[PDB]
Amino acid sequence: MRECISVHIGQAGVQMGNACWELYCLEHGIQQDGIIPDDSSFGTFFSETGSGKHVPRAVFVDLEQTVIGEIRTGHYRSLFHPEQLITGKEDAANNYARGHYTIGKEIVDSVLDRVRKMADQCSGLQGFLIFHSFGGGTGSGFTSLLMERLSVDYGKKSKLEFSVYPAPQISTAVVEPYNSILTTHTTLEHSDCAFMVDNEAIYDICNRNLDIERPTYTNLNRLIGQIVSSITASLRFDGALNVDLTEFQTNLVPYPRIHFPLVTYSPIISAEKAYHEQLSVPEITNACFEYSNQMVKCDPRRGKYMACCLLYRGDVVPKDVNAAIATIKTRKSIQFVDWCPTGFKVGINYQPPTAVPGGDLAKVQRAVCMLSNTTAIAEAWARLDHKFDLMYSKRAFVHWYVGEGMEEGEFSEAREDMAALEKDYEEVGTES
Amino acid sequence: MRECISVHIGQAGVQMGNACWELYCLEHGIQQDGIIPDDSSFGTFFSETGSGKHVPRAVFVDLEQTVIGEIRTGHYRSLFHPEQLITGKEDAANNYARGHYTIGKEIVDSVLDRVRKMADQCSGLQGFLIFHSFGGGTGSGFTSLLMERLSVDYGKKSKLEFSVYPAPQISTAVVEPYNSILTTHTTLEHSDCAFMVDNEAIYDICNRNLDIERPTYTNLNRLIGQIVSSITASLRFDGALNVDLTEFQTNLVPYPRIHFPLVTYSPIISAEKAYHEQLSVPEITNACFEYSNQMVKCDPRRGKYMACCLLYRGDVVPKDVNAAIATIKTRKSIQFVDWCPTGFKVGINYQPPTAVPGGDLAKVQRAVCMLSNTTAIAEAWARLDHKFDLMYSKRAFVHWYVGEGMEEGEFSEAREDMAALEKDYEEVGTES
Amino acid sequence: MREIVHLQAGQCGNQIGAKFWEVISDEHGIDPTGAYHGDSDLQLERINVYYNEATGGKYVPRAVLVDLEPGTMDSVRSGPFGQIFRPDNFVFGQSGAGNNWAKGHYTEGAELVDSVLDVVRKEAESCDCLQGFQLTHSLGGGTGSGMGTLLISKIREEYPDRIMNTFSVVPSPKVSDTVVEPYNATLSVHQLVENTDETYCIDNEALYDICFRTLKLTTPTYGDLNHLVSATMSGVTTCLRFPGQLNADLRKLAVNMVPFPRLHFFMPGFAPLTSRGSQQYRALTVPELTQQMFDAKNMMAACDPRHGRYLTVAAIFRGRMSMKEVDEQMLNVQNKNSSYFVEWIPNNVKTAVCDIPPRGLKMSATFIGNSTAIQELFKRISEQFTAMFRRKAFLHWYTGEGMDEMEFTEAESNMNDLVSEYQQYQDATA
Amino acid sequence: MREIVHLQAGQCGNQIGAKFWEVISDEHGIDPTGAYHGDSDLQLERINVYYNEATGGKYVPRAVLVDLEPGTMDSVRSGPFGQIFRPDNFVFGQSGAGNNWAKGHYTEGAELVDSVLDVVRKEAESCDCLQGFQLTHSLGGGTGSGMGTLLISKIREEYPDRIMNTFSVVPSPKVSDTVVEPYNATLSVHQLVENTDETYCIDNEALYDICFRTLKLTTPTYGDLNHLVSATMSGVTTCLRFPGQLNADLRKLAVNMVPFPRLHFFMPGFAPLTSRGSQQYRALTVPELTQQMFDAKNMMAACDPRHGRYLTVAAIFRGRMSMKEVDEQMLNVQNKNSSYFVEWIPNNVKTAVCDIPPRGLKMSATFIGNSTAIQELFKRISEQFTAMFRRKAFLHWYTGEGMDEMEFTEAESNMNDLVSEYQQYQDATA
């Protein structure tokens, strides 16, 4: 009945998607193909055919064709519908203009059609899940191009996006500040709720809590795979207090332009050191509010919380959830904004998280995913805007962007909009 | 229900802790792991997990990483929680300044967090047990740093510490007087009751009463292990007249700055010569007041008693305890201060002390641990202050301390405070 | 005769209702397949109050299950006593309400309410004598708060004279489970005070206390809480279904419990409640049952009666008892706590005694109390609502669905007036 | 009728109380499971004095067990006759008092006293006719001295007319078991002299003598001492539970034993007490029982009556006896020891005779003596208290919990006044 269309943009989204759909197939008994061996709630993500083959309800789009070409040769070659996997001629080359104005224009009409063929095949449309990179290229331009196209064809339908936000210190591209601001300016008015994660933050978690000194990108994706499973577990499984994707918009977004929650997942524990842990509900709930466990390298205590969604899983008792949240509300260090006395949205599900073979997480009994909107993220935007200001003041790389469909003015408009958003975060955080 | 958090600092505390937790595991049927074979009062020291694994409620902290690294390779490798065992980069090098100002600052925020994760996991918090060395290094600086941090985060909660006080003649470090005074000055106002022991005193006992000419540090620790078991036996086991850790503070500490009891354990007898001893209650009770059995090389009869706690164990009749104490009160040589007509606190427990296999103590039937606060310890402080005065007058080793975060003035302030404490011990010992 | 038709709403109502129909079916001997296998014939005499009959002894509850999402009912029909319900009564949409009152009431439920009414009228018209409508929902959600109040207005406009009683779960003060609770509660209450006869306010936090303190339950699921709510819902409708020394019809309670039209918010209770180990240390007699009924620790609402005064009270007993004891105890309570009872009402207790107790119990009792202390609940919600509303905390989600800021101000004013009215009648004569 | 409610406190009270309820249950035929299997029906007629009834013949003691630490009661409930008590009556905190009166009375017990009262009122209100409250504690501890006196003040303020009798263990003169005894005793006594009707002062040292001298016991545990205390506590409440030729109610004793309001400190006794080997050398008759009752070596208090004078005396006999013998012996004692009895009281003996003796004994007797020699006990404590207080021996532990040095001075002044009053009434007329 319910449905979720997954759009995976760029190398990040495609590689994150590989982990998501390896988990979903495992959460439903699927056999790396559309086949199920000789397992009934899959309908939210998997379309079914008379052959016994289940087809993921996802669209893989990339202007580059090396990452997707690896899927077609991978173990999941025979899972996805071949026309879902869309590849272009030449990548965006870390340039927002190429992704949005020159190359995106030649693929957007193709991905949008395949989305249409999926939207009309659903008994009822619930929302879109967008996976993309914030660094730039396809993830910055194509997404903002696609987001604007979905906003008109589908209007009020929910649009949730998972963004790999740039890390404070770590960086892999030189023009991230240009791409980060340009995409944000064109996605504020077309996105409902953007869940942020940082590679650096997960890198800390992967060695600080999981005992691994060599995290690859596969490890980070498998951690992100768990989060999305938890977010969509209510649709996929039964529970005591369920939550729907359209509930996040109102619960987490007090104002239309402030829709950037952080992310967390408490029981990120090594298998060996799990033998010495009780892993009770009150303790994991407290771990969510520690700076040491955030998946975005932004310290919550530098700001004030504005909304929180606690999505429990597995063996959980709602009485314990009530107690743990009550104590957390008591702590003075954990500060909520005054104008939000009602601070928590709670969701409980009966399905324990499943562990991917060859993975790193322990076989936990119960888990909680926390989605918190905080004013602390205002610091990250200010830091990002400073980097953009340094480069733009010198016109460090402008000639690349201006010469591929964009214009000089858009740099000024994008930055001032980010200034307004940073101002807005300040007004929200002050009272009387 | 009850709880006790054990913090073990430095090489002394860590190695003393190894004996304590080998005894506790033996006192509860534990099997050198968290497992109990196919045993119910452990809850005071051991946290329990659904796996059947019992996790000691202790924190091992050291700036050096050789002693703790040996635990991780020892027989109790799989007992402690790996994050309880905290190790640093480089030791304090017998320098108080390094432990308190330079290296301690980089670990204190880590040990304090693990203490927090234990304090909130207890049904009710009773107090802290601190094991450390008085000679110096981590035990002198880190402890005084940790003690001040616990004093604010937990306020009035009981803080009991077991200190390896420097011996009068025997010494293993050249700068002990500097470390001993500096740590004492910063622990008087943050510690409730400090139980003192001397290596030399136990060395005498180990050969004079136990027939061993080759005591290692393992032998001394096993003797200290018995004492702590007796102190915490009331919480761990049932008895006729129980005593709680918060009772020591009021029973033994008449004044806030005079909280340095001695220690004793009467039936320290070889197995072979135990066959020729009755080991009745009156005789063992009298042994506690003999200078030949004190665990601190300070003669009680050089001063006046101020408080005494007799913690009996095993087959003991309270009528006998009444008689023995009555006779001891009669003896004129055993002098109590006049302003304390009520001189004794008594505790009786039904659990006989357990003998560690491979140990030296006999399989005694009944035992008594005596914790006495005496003015005689004033002599030890005066002796210690004299050694400090000699070195400081020449500035013998000052340059090491001043150059690692400390300052010249602190030497003067620490020493004058010790002078005041020595003066205070004199005022308490005089009447009218 | 005197048939009751049950309406669900949202996930809360559907979960509570599924348990209510398991309890009711238990005391009437109705198997999960619909067949009757009871022993006493008395439980079958008045079985028409909730059930409709069919061929082969099948009995069909007069229940209407509605939600804007089918995930919840699909659990209901898949679980025990789910095949009992008539399939045509599952009226549902595809896109749920995002916990916002505006969507459930104006946009999402508006287009689906007609489908529900067509089932309600069909159910009601099959009743020889319709007593009233019974609605179970939650004020903090979107479907229950929005659609449930939309149904209430529609039915009240279509059946003006019938009694409508609501068993609504109220947001707890301690911790919330939905960030927009003040908006849903305030807007939902704005409708209840005008379009229902007797609302039974309950909150989960209070039921958590009862399980923790009284029942000494260490793993209280929502099934345990819903059983507590079921027992009180069964209690208030036992005279309609069983005989007794003194009967109390739903309208009998409303007359005795509602002095003024708008003061119709009750805080229920139940007794006996004892743990499995403390059962052998209790007499299980009228004097103690009446003692814990008025105990503030045994009430299913957060507000404590000690902070206010009882306008009225009802005590629906069950099981064979001495009528002398019952009256003496109620009088005994009246005398001791004379400060807790409003003085311009000479008698503040309405009594009833049903002859048949719940299965496995020799005696039982259901407490219903209309207390001015309830003003705390609404005042607390007013404080939260005005806090968020002062700076447009989440309005855009509501105004975008068709609402308007004026309605927000009207709802707050109405709730404040009700709080004022409850406070006004807490003062003695002159 | 004339129900007694038992209150515990601290480790001393809980240990004494657990033995008292084993003895009481023995003479009423109550099994450790709560069932009754007695032979004589008389022991069941007045069983309501201490026990409440339940279904299936289960009898539940009207006991309230309280301590600031649960280790002691967990021993109580785990031991024999521990499952008898009602689980709800175990009211306890987590952090115990460190043997300091300040913590138990102002800080630790203050926040827990309300929980106890809510159980006391519930227990008391179930009594057809409440006779009084019975408290067992110790003046040298922290919970008993501090919280026990806090309860005493609370109950006396809530039940002013009821009789409150305390069986308090007093610190011994010979050896102490707590360094701060003078502070706990002085502060606790400051409360007792104003808020209790009859205090039964006992000390362990005296019971050690009795076991050593009379019973010739070589391994006297605390169980043996507590049995002695139990027997006297059973004795003073036998007329309420059994018939006799001459009855003595608790208020009957208080009237006859308390001339002035503040002189209500008694030193109990018991008889017969004989070793296992000396039983075959005794007549076991009234003349000898009365002889050892007044023997200073057979009294459960340190103070010797020879050092003062008896203000009054009570002799609660048990077993079938010749009333002529009883009166003649009491008169015989009165004549010989005329110097030991105050002269402005013409008759200093109150007599009673219960018909049923304790199990295994044909005869028994309980002695209660209000003697001016008790002034030694308080004067001795005053000397210790003023010694420590003269130079702030341990005050910081008390003043830090909320107390103040002024309260210390007031407590000492009050105790000195009581010692003065006891001395004043030791002198003859004019």
Ligand SMILES: Nc1nc2c(ncn2[C@@H]2O[C@H](COP(=O)(O)OP(=O)(O)OP(=O)(O)O)[C@@H](O)[C@H]2O)c(=O)[nH]1
């Ligand atoms: N978590 C995670 N992040 C990734 C992964 N691959 C790339 N990224 C992030 O993506 C950011 C840059 O955007 P890309 O996805 O590499 O570029 P693109 O979306 O393919 O757009 P083009 O530049 O046109 O190729 C980098 O800063 C990485 O942090 C991945 O496998 N896992």
Ligand SMILES: Nc1nc2c(ncn2[C@@H]2O[C@H](COP(=O)(O)OP(=O)(O)OP(=O)(O)O)[C@@H](O)[C@H]2O)c(=O)[nH]1
């Ligand atoms: N009883 C006992 N005492 C010990 C033991 N090990 C060390 N000590 C004492 O510790 C004193 C010196 O302090 P240490 O513990 O060695 O130094 P530290 O605490 O590790 O601090 P650092 O100097 O930074 O290493 C010596 O004088 C010893 O008497 C032990 O195993 N048992």
Ligand SMILES: Nc1nc2c(ncn2[C@@H]2O[C@H](COP(=O)(O)OP(=O)(O)O)[C@@H](O)[C@H]2O)c(=O)[nH]1
């Ligand atoms: N007792 C009980 N309360 C519930 C249950 N489900 C939801 N609630 C309560 O309902 C509120 C959430 O609103 P909800 O009914 O789920 O939204 P709706 O589906 O749109 O009506 C919260 O206050 C929950 O405490 C349940 O099964 N049992």
Ligand SMILES: Nc1nc2c(ncn2[C@@H]2O[C@H](COP(=O)(O)OP(=O)(O)O)[C@@H](O)[C@H]2O)c(=O)[nH]1
């Ligand atoms: N007869 C008897 N006396 C006790 C017992 N336990 C403690 N005491 C006495 O009580 C005093 C100690 O105070 P205590 O009651 O333990 O402290 P509390 O728990 O805070 O009330 C000492 O004088 C003991 O002699 C017992 O089981 N039997």
Ligand SMILES: [Mg+2]
């Ligand atoms: Mg690319």
Ligand SMILES: [Mg+2]
């Ligand atoms: Mg070292």
